[PDB]
Every structure is written in structure tokens, then in C-alpha cells.
Design a protein around this ligand. Structure first.
Ligand SMILES: CCOP(=S)(OCC)Oc1ccc([S@@](C)=O)cc1
Ligand SMILES: CCOP(=S)(OCC)Oc1ccc([S@@](C)=O)cc1
Ligand SMILES: [Co+2]
Ligand SMILES: [Co+2]
Ligand SMILES: [Fe+2]
Ligand SMILES: [Fe+2]
Lengths: 314, 314
């Protein structure tokens, strides 16, 4: 069969249903959580993940793709507990989340032994369990394409050609990282249709977004609610204009919501100023309503949240 | 009383005895081990640690200060089990080990709350235990003193002024990165007598080593065996010229040995060409004899390995 699910039997990609392609049940810094655990409360972290999933499903969400990996505190056992209490289709991934340099472990190690880490997760299981990864997550940001970042990228390029699984990327919309991720992965033999260049919905600079979509890769309008990168309105006018231009087949929409996140910028007291209406159901309360009283039919909605996720994992 | 011990009552600085000031039982990258535990064998790690500590004790070593902190995989419980197995005096520390940037947890976080962590480990306990940290560890390398690195340094200073525990630093010998650590720490009100600037032993430039010592801080000739930083023989002449010029009042010696280390450079086949003689006992096999073989008497040896550590922690 097609797609691995956490705590469940793998599914035919055709049975994915309404999908949020980019959502985090919980993120934290492994290093920080290992050394200072007094800072965390996994009971509040569970109550939060459950409730945010329990809802969403009430809105008809069938599948959630969670791109929490190394650097973000992936926890297959925690994810597995959420599933028990909600019964959601959850897809976990492999990969490394860095902006500048890889952890020391990787000093003098090759691109391949990084790839073998991803491949291990996709074929054997993740973290001692038999739950396999469904995708590879890689990142790049303000610092640009460093030598270490380029390694994690080329490692993914190998994991894809090996396990066929798709590649999700985190990028900076204002600096070209997204185009570089696509540009490198493609030149390594990866099918553009298997790459989701992420966080492209942070810029209202459409000409750019289009070139990434014109080069065959899915465009991620995936941080709805985080006004600090770009407010809801300018995101909605950006999607819309793209759909109207006939790009609804590359468009993939999500929140990037973290039911719990230890990043300081995310202190439950910068919320009102940085990301006021940010949750895992904001597209149902704003985006979808907005897009339908604006000349976009249920068939296009189905293309974005159903057909596109399916194509991505097929 | 003063100095805290791992799995033991707190001793008085006078009971510290012969001490290896910089040695690691086990180091790994927290994120890597958490996500891919299949790369580690915690049975090998306990056997090597217990072994090396035993041999070091058979030479008369009574106490080992262990500067493994965040970024290097500080594991209090593992340490505590090594103490139970050998009977050693183990000094565990707190702090953050980074070259460039802090974990993502620290975005939009202040120096005070970074310091609050260190103080927590010192006054309350480590990783949920009653074992308390006896010192703070910081770092800087080729990257230099970055905005984030500086934060750790200044946070260390705050913890020091609040607890009185000393500070052990990691430094690059050929870039002044150590001189700056001293600058900043002392400027912030840290008694230079409470600082140990590490890895000065990697350079034969004695003028630089003297300047740091002259300014009232201990000098770390603490990587004996790591031929890739500096061969044993050239380290020997350097530590000799320093002792002859009367600097044993600030000289501290150790190996920075890691009974197990996940860095790709520490792969047991570079050993021959990188650090063949690198052990936790090399200085007994080569260094101490060499000194006697030459000028140094047994009164100087005591001060370097017994009195200096006693000052440091007093
Ligand atoms: C500058 C970082 O912005 P913040 S932490 O802002 C939260 C108010 O937004 C983010 C940042 C990272 C993520 S990822 C870890 O899911 C999700 C949201
Ligand atoms: C052996 C691991 O790396 P190398 S050969 O140096 C490569 C930077 O030596 C080191 C480097 C760093 C350390 S830290 C863990 O005290 C210990 C030994
Ligand atoms: Co991202
Ligand atoms: Co060091
Ligand atoms: Fe994300
Ligand atoms: Fe060290």
C-alpha cells in the first residue's frame, strides 16, 4: 500500500481524505528538554494536542501530516498516544531541521550516512517502533544555503530516489531558499511533483511563488494564522489570485499550528500581537469561507485539500 | 559545605584530592540520539566509562570534574551509575555548549532566564535529581564570540555571582576567543580566579597563554593526547617553559578524554593518525615523568593537580 500512518495500518493514498499537510502536534528542542525537563508539562502537551485534533476532525479533517523531525523534537510514542485518543490519520516524517549547521555528531560524516538515517526511518521504523516515516523534511532560512544545509538537502534527494516518499521543505519566502531547495533536489534526480516548497505564503510576491509552481513543485501556503510572517488578509488575497490564475493544482494550504511549542517567540503572551487568530481550524473559520464567496467552488477546494495531498503521496 | 558530588554527599574543597579537571564520561548530540537511538550502545558506553575511571583511580586520581553539558549530552543518571560502579568523586556542571547559535527554544529569550537554568541545576538539582551542579560550562570556537555565544557567557557570569560556583570554558587557542571570555566575564564582575580558560594547551604561543594567566585566570592545558590540536611532545615543552617561568600557580592539566564520543572525527580508525595515545591516563605515562625527568619536583605537581583545583572550587 501507499502511505504509512502512526498507530495504524498504512493507507491507499486515495483514502487520505481532507488533509492538513503541515501541522505540529508538539515541537521542542531535544537538547533543551533533555537537560531541563522542569520547563515542560507533557500532560498539558497532551490535552492540547488531543483537543486541537478532536476539533479539526469536527470540521472534517481526515488526515494530518506532521513534519516534526530532528531539531523539532519528534516523538513517535507521543504521536502514537494522540492517535489512540482521537483516531486521526497521522503521517510522521524523517529529516533534519537546521538553519546553519548540523549537530556535532555529523562532523566528518558523509551525505550518505545522513541519508541512511532517513531511509532507516522509512523502512525499519522510527525511534525503536515500527511506525514508518512517510516523507522527508528539510529546512533553510535567513542564513541561506549553508554547506551543512546543502547536505541535508542532498541526503533527502537520496531518500526519495530510494523510498520514493515525498519531500517537504521549510524555506524563507523573501530570500530564495525555496527556489534553491527545488533547484538542487531537481538536479539530483528528484521528481518536482514530489516536492512541497514550504512557507511560500509568507510573501505576497506572487511572481516568485509562480516560478516555483511553474517548475513543477507544490507551493505551500502553509502558515495561516501566523500574522507575524504575513497577516490572514494578505494571505487570502494571495491564494485567491493564484487560484484565479489557475494554480489551484499546486496550491497546498495549512496552518503550521503547534499545539505546544517551546520557542520563546511563541510565549502565550505575544499571541495577541504576533498571531492572534492562530489555531488548527483557522482555514475553516476564515480562508474557506472567504474563498467560496469569491468564485471558488467545492471542486477546487477538493483539489487543494484532497487531490493535491493525494498526488503528493502517490 | 561547598562542592557538590554526583551520588555522594558534598565535600569540602580540601577533600578534593588529586583531580583531573576536564574529562568526559560520555558525549553525544542530544537531538541525534533522541531521534535515532539505533546508533548508540549504552552498554559499551558504561563499560568504557567504568573502565577508564578505574584505571585513572589506580593512578591516584580521586576526583574527576566532568564538563559535559547541553549540546554534549549531559546524563546525570548515567554519571550517577558510573559513580556507583567505581566510587569516584564526580563533579558535574551546568551550562550551554554551542559554537554559533542557541537551540530554537531561546529565540526571544533573555539572558536572565538562560541563567535561571544554570542556577536551577546548581541550587535545586540536575535533570530532576538532587545531584547539584558544581560549576558552569561555556564555549566558543572558530565562529568567535557571536551574539548568542555572548549571551551564554553573560548568563554564566550571573550564575557565578549568585552561586559562587566557578566557570570552565571551551576556547579556540588560535583566535583570541579565550581572552574575550575572560574580558566579558571579569567585566561582568566575575573574579578571574573563578574562571578556567580551556584549550590553551593547543597552542605553543606561550605569550598568549601568559597574558590570560597574567590576568588572573587558570590556563587549560587540557587536551593531552589529541595530536591533531598539538602533539604531546610540543605540549610538554610548552607546559615545561610555563612551569620554569613560574606559572604553576595557574596551570591546570587534563586530557579532555571521552570514553565515548559520537563525533564523526572520533571514529576508531582516524585514531592512529589523529590521537593514537589519547587516554585518561596519558599524563601519568608521559607528562608527569617528563617534568621530573627534567626540572619539576613533586611539590609543583601537587599544586597543579591538587591545590589549583582546590582554589578554583573555594
Ligand atoms: C519567529 C518564530 O515565529 P513563531 S515561534 O511565532 C509564534 C507567535 O511561529 C512559528 C515558528 C515555528 C513553527 S514550527 C516549529 O512549527 C511554527 C510557528
Ligand atoms: C574526537 C571528537 O572530536 P575531536 S578528534 O576534534 C574534532 C573537532 O576531539 C574532540 C573534540 C571535542 C571534544 S569535547 C566533547 O570535550 C572532545 C574531543
Ligand atoms: Co517551517
Ligand atoms: Co571543549
Ligand atoms: Fe512546520
Ligand atoms: Fe571537553
Amino acid at each position: 500500500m501507499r502511505i504509512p500512518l502512526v498507530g495504524k495500518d498504512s493507507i491507499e493514498s486515495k483514502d487520505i481524505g481532507f488533509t492538513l499537510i503541515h501541522e505540529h502536534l508538539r515541537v521542542f528542542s531535544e537538547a533543551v528538554r533533555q537537560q531541563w525537563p522542569h520547563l515542560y508539562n507533557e500532560d498539558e502537551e497532551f490535552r492540547n494536542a488531543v483537543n486541537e485534533v478532536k476539533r479539526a476532525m469536527q470540521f472534517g479533517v481526515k488526515t494530518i501530516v506532521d513534519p516534526t523531525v530532528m531539531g523539532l523534537g519528534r516523538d513517535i510514542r507521543f504521536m502514537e498516544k494522540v492517535v489512540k485518543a482521537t483516531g486521526i490519520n497521522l503521517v510522521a516524517g524523517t529529516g533534519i531541521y537546521i538553519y546553519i549547521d548540523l549537530p556535532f555528531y555529523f562532523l566528518n560524516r558523509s551525505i550518505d550516512e545522513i541519508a541512511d538515517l532517513f531511509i532507516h526511518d522509512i523502512k525499519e521504523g522510527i525511534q525503536g517502533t515500527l511506525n514508518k516515516a512517510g516523507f522527508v523534511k528539510i529546512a533553510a532560512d535567513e542564513p541561506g544555503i549553508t554547506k551543512d544545509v546543502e547536505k541535508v538537502i542532498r541526503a533527502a534527494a537520496i531518500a526519495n530516489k530510494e523510498t520514493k516518499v515525498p519531500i517537504i521543505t521549510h524555506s524563507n519566502a523573501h530570500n530564495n531558499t525555496g527556489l534553491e531547495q527545488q533547484r538542487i533536489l531537481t538536479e539530483e534526480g528528484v521528481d518536482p511533483g514530489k516536492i512541497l516548497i514550504g512557507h511560500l505564503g509568507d510573501t505576497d510576491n506572487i511572481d516568485y511563488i509562480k516560478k516555483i509552481a511553474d517548475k513543477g513543485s507544490f507551493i505551500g501556503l502553509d502558515r495561516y494564522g501566523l500574522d507575524l510572517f504575513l497577516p490572514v488578509d494578505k494571505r487570502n488575497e494571495t491564494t485567491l489570485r493564484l487560484i484565479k490564475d489557475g494554480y489551484s493544482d499546486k496550491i497546498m494550504i495549512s496552518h503550521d499550528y503547534c499545539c505546544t511549542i517551546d520557542w520563546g517567540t511563541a510565549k502565550p503572551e505575544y499571541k495577541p500581537k504576533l498571531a492572534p487568530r492562530w489555531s488548527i481550524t483557522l482555514i475553516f473559520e476564515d480562508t474557506i469561507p472567504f474563498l467560496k464567496r469569491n468564485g471558488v467552488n467545492e471542486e477546487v477546494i477538493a483539489t487543494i485539500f484532497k487531490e493535491n495531498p493525494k498526488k503528493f503521496f502517490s
